[PDB]
From a paper:
Aminoglycoside phosphotransferases, APHs, catalyze the transfer of a phosphate to a hydroxyl group of the antibiotic. APH(2″)-IVa confers a high level of resistance in several Enterococcus strains towards various aminoglycosides that are prescribed in clinics, and it can use either ATP or GTP as phospho-donor. APH(2″)-IVa is specific for 4,6-disubstituted aminoglycosides as phosphate acceptors.
Interestingly, the interaction between Glu238 and the ring A of aminoglycoside is maintained even if the substituent in the 6′-position of G418 is different. However, its interaction with ring B is, in turn, abolished. Similar to kanamycin A and tobramycin structures, ring C is maintained by an interaction with Asp197. In general, the APH(2″)-IVa ∙ G418 complex is characterized by less interactions than the binary complex with tobramycin, which may be at the origin of the weaker affinity of G418 compared to tobramycin. More importantly, the H-bond formed between Glu235 and 2′-OH of kanamycin A is replaced by a salt bridge with 2′-NH3+ of tobramycin or G418. However, the crystal structure of the APH(2″)-IVa ∙ G418 complex shows that the hydroxyl and methyl groups on the C6′ of G418 do not create novel interactions with the protein. The absence of a primary amine on C6′ of ring A seems to affect the binding affinity of aminoglycosides for APH. Indeed, G418 has a weaker affinity for the apoprotein than gentamicin, with a secondary amine at C6′, and even weaker than sisomicin with a primary amine.
Author numbering: 2 to 297
The structure:
């Protein structure tokens, strides 16, 4: 699915006739949504497909709830679409947040003082977010990790039966068995997490040299809080392990060794996710890649 500018303008003007669009342009494009910037004050997201539509819904449902409870700015919901055909939510419109993504490059050009400060600021955020009371959220927001794995294991065998020989397939089973036999990946206290906590979603003020917002809650869910630290650890694309080590100290984490153990798993696991996401997105280059990494 893709949208023209006209199409988009119709969608909004329709449910919101007493709201005129002056400037519209594309702020960016994701795997689930295209993001349009309207009047320079708003980000409107349009889903590119049914699953994206569902994430959008959650992002909306979630931001409403945690609106005005966190240390840093997050987006505010202002405009909502309608369910329709296969899409649960047509589109949505959030307030724009001034800022630049705090890319790892940027991060290391800041003086050590502003670096140590951002560490402390993120820790505070993650800390608050993970404290929010989960008793009100409906069950479907609880991501059960053990189910996800089992579900994945099955999708894989379908998709790989006609790609792999007995002795190759037995290595995947071995791998999944080892994950599922390990209690550490599952025995956590669930809480609300961002679940895509990367640099691309951390906004930064070039004047003040301080973090000035957080932004994509499309994947947010009730899950293992360690996931919000792991997403920052990959060395090439995200911040260091060394930087994330500081966040953890201000967050006063009790089991850092466990978190690293989870990272190593997720990193290996990502191979399999490329295959799954690759087939349904479908990026065939994701699918070819994962198939080669697996063979190890
Ligand atoms: C719902 N969509 C999400 C989507 O947001 C995205 O998340 C990325 C994630 O892929 C990246 O992380 C992943 O992808 C990168 C790859 C793109 O270079 C790999 O280097 C890395 O090992 C892997 N963990 C991470 N660096 C940023 C997140 N925002 O990819 C995963 C996803 C589940 O499809």
């Amino acid at each position: 699915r893709t949208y023209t500018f006209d199409q988009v303008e119709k969608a909004i003007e329709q449910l919101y006739p007493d709201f005129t669009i002056n400037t519209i342009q594309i702020s960016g494009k994701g795997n689930d949504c295209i993001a349009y910037e309207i009047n320079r004050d708003f980000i409107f997201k349009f889903p590119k497909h049914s699953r994206g539509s569902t994430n959008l819904f959650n992002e909306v449902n979630i931001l409403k709830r945690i609106h005005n409870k966190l240390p840093l700015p997050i987006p505010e919901v202002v405009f909502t679409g309608m369910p329709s055909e296969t899409y649960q939510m047509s589109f949505a419109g959030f307030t724009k947040i001034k800022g630049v993504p705090l890319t790892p490059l940027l991060l290391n050009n800041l003086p050590k003082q502003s670096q140590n400060q951002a560490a402390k600021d993120l820790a505070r955020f993650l800390s608050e977010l993970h404290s929010i009371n989960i008793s009100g959220f409906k069950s479907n927001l609880v991501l059960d990790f053990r189910e996800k794995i089992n579900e994945d294991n099955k999708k894989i065998k379908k998709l790989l039966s006609r790609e792999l020989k007995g002795p190759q397939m037995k290595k995947v089973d071995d791998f999944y068995r080892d994950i599922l036999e390990n209690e550490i990946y599952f025995k956590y206290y669930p809480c609300l997490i961002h679940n895509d906590f990367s640099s691309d979603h951390i906004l930064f003020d070039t004047e003040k040299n301080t973090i000035c917002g957080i932004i994509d809650f499309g994947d947010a869910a009730i899950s293992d809080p360690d996931n919000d630290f792991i997403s920052l650890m990959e060395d090439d694309e995200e911040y260091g392990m060394e930087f994330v080590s500081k966040i953890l100290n201000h967050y006063k984490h009790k089991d850092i060794p466990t978190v690293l153990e989870k990272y190593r798993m997720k990193e290996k696991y990502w191979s399999f996710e490329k295959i799954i996401y690759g087939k349904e997105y479908g990026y065939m280059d994701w699918y070819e890649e994962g198939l080669n990494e697996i063979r190890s």
